[PDB]
Amino acid sequence: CGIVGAIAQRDVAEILLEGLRRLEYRGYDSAGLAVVDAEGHMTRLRRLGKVQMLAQAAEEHPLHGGTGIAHTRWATHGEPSEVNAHPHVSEHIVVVHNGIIENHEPLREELKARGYTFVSETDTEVIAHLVNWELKQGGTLREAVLRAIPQLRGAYGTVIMDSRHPDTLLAARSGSPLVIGLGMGENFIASDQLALLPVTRRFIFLEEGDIAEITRRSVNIFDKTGAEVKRQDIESNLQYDAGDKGIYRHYMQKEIYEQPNAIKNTLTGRISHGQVDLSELGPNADELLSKVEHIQILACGTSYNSGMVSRYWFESLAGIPCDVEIASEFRYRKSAVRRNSLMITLSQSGETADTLAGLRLSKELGYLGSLAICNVPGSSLVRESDLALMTNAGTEIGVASTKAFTTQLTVLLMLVAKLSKLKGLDASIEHDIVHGLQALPSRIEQMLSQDKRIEALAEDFSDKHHALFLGRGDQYPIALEGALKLKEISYIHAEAYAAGELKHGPLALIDADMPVIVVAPNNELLEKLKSNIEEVRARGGQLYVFADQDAGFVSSDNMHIIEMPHVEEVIAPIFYTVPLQLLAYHVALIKGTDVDQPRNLAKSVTVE
Amino acid sequence: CGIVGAIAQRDVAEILLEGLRRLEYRGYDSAGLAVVDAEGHMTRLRRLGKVQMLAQAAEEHPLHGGTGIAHTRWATHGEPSEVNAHPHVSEHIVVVHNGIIENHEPLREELKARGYTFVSETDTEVIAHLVNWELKQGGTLREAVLRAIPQLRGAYGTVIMDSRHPDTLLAARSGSPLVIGLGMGENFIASDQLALLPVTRRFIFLEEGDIAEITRRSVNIFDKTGAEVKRQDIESNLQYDAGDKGIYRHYMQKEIYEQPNAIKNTLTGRISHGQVDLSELGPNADELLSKVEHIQILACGTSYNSGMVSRYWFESLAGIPCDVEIASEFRYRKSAVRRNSLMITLSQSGETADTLAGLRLSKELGYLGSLAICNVPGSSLVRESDLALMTNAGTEIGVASTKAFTTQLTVLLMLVAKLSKLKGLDASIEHDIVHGLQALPSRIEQMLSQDKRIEALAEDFSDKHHALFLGRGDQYPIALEGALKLKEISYIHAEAYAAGELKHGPLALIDADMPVIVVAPNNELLEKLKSNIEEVRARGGQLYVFADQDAGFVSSDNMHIIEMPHVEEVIAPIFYTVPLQLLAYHVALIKGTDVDQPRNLAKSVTVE
Ligand SMILES: O=C(CO)[C@@H](O)[C@H](O)[C@H](O)COP(=O)(O)O
Ligand SMILES: O=C(CO)[C@@H](O)[C@H](O)[C@H](O)COP(=O)(O)O
């Protein structure tokens, strides 16, 4: 979800709306804002649907005033409803929050029994009634919030307002991000600096436990207790472009086309003279990485798929045992820890709840250390890991990851090179990987010029409701990732298989209507994969084969061959992802689906 | 595929047909037979389709004579065609074969260049033209076959006939099973004794390299060279019932209902006084199993799914690191071998080509040892493993495994108990597992009495083309197995997910038409799973929850709760499989699909 707050001299409603538009990719099931004018007349508006529903409403009933808070949300529990939309109130108290109040249930009973009525089942109302109760003796809002916060347990961020005293906002960071934007004679707050770029580039990042008292002219941050702490303001490092689509129709589209440049940025400072350079990790990292006998990778969704590709690399190239597991399963099992095991999390956001819970469990279980591969500076996974290797792909706004996945593989391959060197293996392994990486942005630039043939193919998917994706070896998780892209944004029921598994049952699914998408680099598995493709064609499947130009496939009625330029084997999985990203994009366009904000979802699963 | 041969005084055509009916589950894309009368007039008949197509043809054109061979086949390459149906000929030579002639291609060119014409691309014709060439100087058929066999490389079984001399059949076992049935004044051969039960129970199992010269009155087996070897005939140990359906409409149905009795048979001799007893493994097995620090399980399809369940058991109960991998991916990767690693294959048939290739690779890679868990005495995996633990489930004929899967889990759980004892862990782990196992046939008998409610539910799937299955923890591979059953035999596009993965993309698939099947034991993951189910319901999914009676689910419009009796947690995955087997069965009935012989498949993938 996304939180924006604002305390200014000028009206803030437009600012709060522009803030929600920018955080929309985090939840687009509902949104609301509440604005108090200097006279304390508070106007609250809440709508079901995308932020535009709220903006439209606001245009009919405009909201005057300098103080306000706003929210946009991914509704998990129950069908989304306007009754549950934020902000929530308790008379004069008004509240928005992100994250979770773990002890929702006892606090609720206790407030009920003190005489409160609950209009919703949200945690937000719990926080509202509680602060109302804390104020009932008559102190300052800050005083009540200091009393209130210790009674709340869980991982959450909240902004709180007393409409009787529109001069001050209170915010409390306790598990979920909050950041204050510093203006001139006005201040703002948000769950992500991205929402505040249009009015300020100067930010104070609250640390866990911080409570902030914010007026037009002052920012006072206090610790756990009531003691003031010092927090440095800094200049934004995000791009000025941020959540602008530029010439692109979709964020996803932009992010697919940005991949050559994002990859270059992932590589900056990290390749030198035919070798990989990960000295940014510092003068104790080699000692650690040198002791690694086993790698455990933990991730969700597309970040799990890149870990699955790298497993083939780590075992075959660095000779290191590597397991990859989805984090929602790992975090609850009673696992057997390998000797000398490195925990690697992959996460674009660095905030995914299950991945984060895996990392926290791993400390307790005695792994050797942990390495974060992350796209977000200063996210939870980065600060709680022993080591971090940032992807440098830039902000990613498309709910479906494209550039995050391919820059993750780039970094994995670097770490494969580094480990192969620390183990004293053939120097050629590192050389060949570095040759790969060095060609990679140009190879991707070159694959993107196949976009028009893929766009033409996508029209065939117009009447389709199913698809199968097939790959073998290190291309098998590339099939997984293409099937996930396709089903997530076009809603075709796409399913991936390692090609060797069909004759054990799934081949029953093939009839004359089933399209089957395959990635076919010209490598030692080509003949084995060709056999699989023939098994599919023999039962009437419609084949779409992205194959190397010299693979020798013969095009026909049910065999559509999209010829691919040559590529270094070591980077072949990254290259073959690109056509599947384009195909998913184009099919979604044909289907008329919301490519950037697919239904039932939002980006980054930060609450379990 | 399935091979039958016969050399008798009486007509053999009916016998050869009855033989193919019994081997049909091995391939039902085409079949053929060739029969020579005492005058050497040879009649060959071949039909596309199930064996009944051939039998019907035979009823129109009956085939007299005492000598013949027959085949039924799973067509892999190309659309099945009558031109490719076996037997194949080269004038007077007639041949059927199973397996693969790896050097098909050079032998073919060489025969072409000697003047042969090829009517098909089958390996069978290669063998036929080659034996024709070997006879062209004029020796005995046996002589030519001894010259021919060394020129063939690969894993295959073949029976060969010269219609000019109907007095003798030649067969050669070189990688694929052959067995001779001994009659009285007549002999038979088949690729599996199951085909010969109706005329004999006395068998000679050929060993690899064996060449057999078979007449009405004699069986001479020769080794690699021309030297005679001794092979003992034995009495069949299969059940008299074998490939009879009895009162059951389908083999699959029978095999589902047999599970309590099959499980009892898996347990016989192996539980004693609250402890597991695996002393059948012998007086060097404990030494081995005692050194195990890591377990690698290799299997395909449903046998991979049982390995995935046991991974949760091995790590959480015996504290042993366990990886599970599909064998088609394992056999071609350059893997990193763990120290002290036990290779475990799971296979009903004991002959699955990829699983077998994994086991063979593991010898070469230096694992500690290998353990086969198999349903077939004397199959390849059993004889090439260091240790074997048979499931004792009895012959399984349904192309889709039911009893094989559940008896595999039973044996896995026993081995978990044994390892937990060898490691000196809490004695209660073994006790609780043995309490589980001891209740298990009755718990299964009790689940089978829920069949009528499941049959009623299945009618809802009549208009459905998709389904999702959800599970967490050790029930997650139970969802995988239920989705595989459903898609294999009903052709609904069923897909399994660990419940925690939906919000990372797959939840986009949920609309008002999607049925979602969930297994919900009353265990520590119930509340976490309930959250997932609510996420699905909130977007309009149709929930089918097989839940413990005390799980507290509330039934409604899109929430169908099938209440399950209580069960011991340790056996909960085995118990919750049963309702998904029944549901798949009943949905297939509603859809009017061939439950026992699903399209595009056959049972056991014995050629890659
Ligand atoms: O982007 C997608 C789908 O295309 C998601 O599957 C994620 O990859 C995921 O939810 C993990 O998120 P991060 O941990 O990478 O932030
Ligand atoms: O029965 C099924 C499908 O329900 C197959 O997926 C197999 O389990 C498989 O082909 C492995 O065969 P076996 O190795 O167990 O003989």
From Swiss-Prot, chains A, B:
GO biological processes: carbohydrate metabolic process; fructose 6-phosphate metabolic process; protein N-linked glycosylation; UDP-N-acetylglucosamine biosynthetic process; UDP-N-acetylglucosamine metabolic process
Induction section of the entry: Post-transcriptionally regulated by the GlmY/GlmZ sRNA regulatory cascade. The sRNA GlmZ, together with Hfq, directly activates glmS mRNA translation through base-pairing. A second sRNA, GlmY, positively regulates glmS indirectly, by sequestering the adapter protein RapZ and protecting GlmZ from RNA cleavage.
InterPro entries in UniProt: GATase_2_dom, GFAT, GFAT_N, GlmS/AgaS_SIS, GlmS/FrlB_SIS, Ntn_hydrolases_N, SIS_dom, SIS_dom_sf
The entry's keywords: Aminotransferase, Cytoplasm, Glutamine amidotransferase, Repeat, Transferase
Gene Ontology MF terms in the entry: carbohydrate derivative binding; glutamine-fructose-6-phosphate transaminase (isomerizing) activity
Catalysis: reaction(s): D-fructose 6-phosphate + L-glutamine = D-glucosamine 6-phosphate + L-glutamate
The protein's assembly and partners: Homodimer. In pull-down experiments interacts with CedA.
Name listed for the protein in its UniProt record: Glutamine--fructose-6-phosphate aminotransferase [isomerizing]
Lineage of the organism: Bacteria, Pseudomonadati, Pseudomonadota, Gammaproteobacteria, Enterobacterales
